[PDB]
Design an enzyme around this catalytic site. Structure first.
Site, PDB file in Angstrom:
ATOM      1  N   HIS A 183       9.363  -8.103   1.084  1.00 61.42           N
ATOM      2  CA  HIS A 183       9.973  -7.012   1.846  1.00 61.42           C
ATOM      3  C   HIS A 183       9.808  -7.192   3.375  1.00 61.42           C
ATOM      4  O   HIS A 183      10.408  -6.415   4.120  1.00 61.42           O
ATOM      5  CB  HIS A 183       9.567  -5.612   1.359  1.00 61.42           C
ATOM      6  CG  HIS A 183       8.170  -5.201   1.703  1.00 61.42           C
ATOM      7  ND1 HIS A 183       7.246  -4.874   0.716  1.00 61.42           N
ATOM      8  CD2 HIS A 183       7.592  -5.025   2.910  1.00 61.42           C
ATOM      9  CE1 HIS A 183       6.145  -4.524   1.354  1.00 61.42           C
ATOM     10  NE2 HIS A 183       6.300  -4.595   2.675  1.00 61.42           N
ATOM     11  N   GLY A 233       1.930  -1.655   8.262  1.00 61.07           N
ATOM     12  CA  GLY A 233       1.465  -2.902   8.846  1.00 61.07           C
ATOM     13  C   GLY A 233       0.414  -3.606   8.009  1.00 61.07           C
ATOM     14  O   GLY A 233       0.121  -4.779   8.269  1.00 61.07           O
ATOM     15  N   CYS A 288       0.666  -4.317   4.758  1.00 58.39           N
ATOM     16  CA  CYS A 288       1.226  -5.127   3.669  1.00 58.39           C
ATOM     17  C   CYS A 288       0.899  -6.588   3.824  1.00 58.39           C
ATOM     18  O   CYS A 288       0.753  -7.068   4.943  1.00 58.39           O
ATOM     19  CB  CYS A 288       2.719  -4.892   3.494  1.00 58.39           C
ATOM     20  SG  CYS A 288       3.137  -3.168   3.157  1.00 58.39           S
TER      21      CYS A 288
HETATM   22  C1  LIG Z   1      10.897  -1.796   6.719  1.00 54.91           C
HETATM   23  C2  LIG Z   1      10.239  -0.607   6.085  1.00 54.91           C
HETATM   24  O1  LIG Z   1      10.658   0.526   6.274  1.00 54.91           O
HETATM   25  N1  LIG Z   1       9.129  -0.814   5.342  1.00 54.91           N
HETATM   26  C3  LIG Z   1       8.831  -2.031   4.569  1.00 54.91           C
HETATM   27  C4  LIG Z   1       8.384  -1.671   3.158  1.00 54.91           C
HETATM   28  N2  LIG Z   1       7.263  -0.728   3.211  1.00 54.91           N
HETATM   29  C5  LIG Z   1       6.715  -0.469   1.884  1.00 54.91           C
HETATM   30  C6  LIG Z   1       5.456   0.380   1.918  1.00 54.91           C
HETATM   31  O2  LIG Z   1       5.259   1.265   1.090  1.00 54.91           O
HETATM   32  N3  LIG Z   1       4.598   0.070   2.917  1.00 54.91           N
HETATM   33  C7  LIG Z   1       3.331   0.668   3.124  1.00 54.91           C
HETATM   34  C8  LIG Z   1       2.220   0.290   2.371  1.00 54.91           C
HETATM   35  N4  LIG Z   1       1.019   0.867   2.488  1.00 54.91           N
HETATM   36  C9  LIG Z   1       0.896   1.855   3.377  1.00 54.91           C
HETATM   37  C10 LIG Z   1       1.933   2.305   4.169  1.00 54.91           C
HETATM   38  C11 LIG Z   1       3.181   1.700   4.060  1.00 54.91           C
HETATM   39  C12 LIG Z   1       4.318   2.145   4.967  1.00 54.91           C
HETATM   40  C13 LIG Z   1       4.292   3.500   5.612  1.00 54.91           C
HETATM   41  C14 LIG Z   1       5.287   3.216   4.555  1.00 54.91           C
HETATM   42  C15 LIG Z   1       7.707   0.510   3.857  1.00 54.91           C
HETATM   43  C16 LIG Z   1       8.095   0.229   5.294  1.00 54.91           C
END
Ligand SMILES: CC(=O)N1CCN(CC(=O)Nc2cnccc2C2CC2)CC1
Ligand SMILES: CC(=O)N1CCN(CC(=O)Nc2cnccc2C2CC2)CC1
EC number: 3.4.19.12
Lengths: 304, 304
Positions: B41, B143, B145
């Site tokens: 992703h 951030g 991930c």
């Molecule tokens: C490009 C985009 O919008 N992304 C790329 C995929 N991500 C997926 C996602 O669940 N990530 C995430 C994981 N752990 C804590 C927090 C977060 C993010 C605040 C959501 C979400 C954000």
């Protein structure tokens, strides 16, 4: 989201751990620059621990009696001195992995990470706090002495603790890196009872703010209190008095959540009086006090 | 003595963390040999996450669109491929700090350490478990991930998890290092509800053995039970069924303490039915289930 008891990454400290042997005793040492720091009780036999005269016992030791091994390689000891309850073993080689570092003496309530070691080898890392009675509730077996506590500010490791003793009650005592014990403890196998292990109020409030930031809000109530009223309840529950300095330190968490510090105090007051009623806050059934307000801001913001 | 939630020393994993940027998205990557692993992703915009066609989105990306930075130095990407939900970015330089490693797919109930990272930089280390519903309860912000979960067996790092998603309920989902999600989760921003988060019975029993080894013995009772009787109570309390395989795994702890596994099951059964009554076990007011029997033996013996 989510909130965990998190330790600092231990790599910078792993690169400093060495094994120190004196006679039949082996424990850990901390190698920074050309000095290895370790508990002075490395020179004691089991019998000596009952009533050791460290200055006298140290006269019988020479540089060659301290065996320092970093990995599978032996370091040459060219000097040794006692500073309070630690020995400083001067070696002929500066630790090439010495990080930027400071020696700090922490206050009760402050948290730090421990890298538990055996035979100079790291076994695990965990987070703890200097209790208000100057003990720490660690996880240390025989051979773990000389393991250290630290905090990291970006690339600088502030060493704050070195493990020395396990009290008859299973709690732990140690020194700063200048060899001064935290609290009244001594490196002697004798009656040393700890005082009251009160709860670190400002840390509990910081953790309740972390709970609100992460969605656990059931305990928020319709009340407020004053510092004096709150402290009357805190005294009754063996919680540390909350001061205006603590309220100031909680300011950024209050601003982020919009919950006034005294309103959170009132929520904590009701939790103390009413209990949890079988409910949990951030996966805990008790009020957690080993997160400082700085730890909460750091974890909730993502400081590396 | 003392028993802490302890993570593995993180140094070997810190030496593998890199930053991966694709377009406007930056997350973490794991650099082992000449390959950087990261969530696929990284190629998505916020809009793309709603219904991404990864194969189609990846066609628009070339090697030069993946920016990999290790510390403050840029790595050259000479190949890229998708394996399930991870991208493998082949770089021209083998990671000089690559530890001995394996990729393993863990079972629910198994514990592991997470090195939470932001922008390829380590922020903290914590211990968690693969829940019976295939989620993990971590601490991850935007951030994080690409941060990884691992276990260490002396000098070999077994990587078992890579962080990908935060579910609408605040729990986390991710993959093994072959890119296969744990459980039914997908890398799409859609309705994904977790199943029942049952308690890992064999881990609770292991932790009650750690409590007896460390002096907390108040919950030991005069009763015994059978697997079938225990499991009737466990089902009612949303605890995982205990099997003869679990009883066998607890054998060494039973031998060390002299407490038969079924007797500990009976003590746990009374704790479930009666509650804690305001008491604690190893500083906890709830029954801890994120220590496996192997973790208890390791911590209580001092494995480095
Ligand atoms: C490009 C985009 O919008 N992304 C790329 C995929 N991500 C997926 C996602 O669940 N990530 C995430 C994981 N752990 C804590 C927090 C977060 C993010 C605040 C959501 C979400 C954000
Ligand atoms: C030579 C000797 O008998 N010593 C040298 C001083 N030590 C002091 C001591 O309290 N160490 C210790 C610290 N943490 C956990 C466990 C232990 C040990 C089982 C006691 C005791 C053992």
């Amino acid at each position: 989201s989510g909130f965990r008891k998190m330790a600092f990454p231990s790599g910078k400290v792993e690169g400093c751990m060495v094994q120190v042997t004196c006679g039949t005793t082996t424990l850990n040492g901390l190698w920074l620059d050309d000095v290895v720091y370790c508990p002075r009780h490395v020179i004691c036999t089991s019998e000596d621990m009952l009533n050791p005269n460290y200055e006298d016992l140290l006269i019988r030791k020479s540089n060659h009696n301290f065996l320092v091994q970093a990995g599978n390689v032996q370091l040459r000891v060219i000097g040794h001195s006692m500073q309070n309850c630690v020995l400083k073993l001067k070696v002929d080689t500066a630790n090439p992995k010495t990080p930027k570092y400071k020696f700090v003496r922490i206050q009760p309530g402050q948290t730090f990470s421990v890298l538990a070691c055996y035979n100079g080898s790291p076994s695990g890392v965990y987070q703890c706090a200097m209790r208000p009675n100057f003990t720490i509730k660690g996880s240390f077996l025989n051979g773990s002495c000389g393991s250290v506590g630290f905090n990291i500010d970006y690339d600088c490791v502030s060493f704050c603790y070195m493990h020395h003793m396990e009290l008859p009650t299973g709690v732990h005592a140690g020194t700063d890196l200048e060899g001064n014990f935290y609290g009244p403890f001594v490196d002697r196998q004798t009656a040393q009872a700890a005082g009251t292990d009160t709860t670190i109020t400002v840390n509990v409030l910081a953790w309740l703010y972390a709970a609100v930031i992460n969605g656990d809000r059931w305990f928020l109530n319709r009340f407020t209190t004053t510092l004096n009223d709150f402290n009357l309840v805190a005294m009754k529950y063996n919680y540390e008095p909350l001061t205006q300095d603590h309220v100031d330190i909680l300011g950024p968490l209050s601003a982020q959540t919009g919950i006034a510090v005294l309103d959170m105090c009132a929520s904590l007051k009701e939790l103390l009086q009413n209990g949890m009623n079988g409910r949990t806050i951030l996966g805990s059934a008790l009020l957690e006090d080993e997160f400082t307000p700085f730890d909460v801001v750091r974890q909730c913001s993502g400081v590396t």
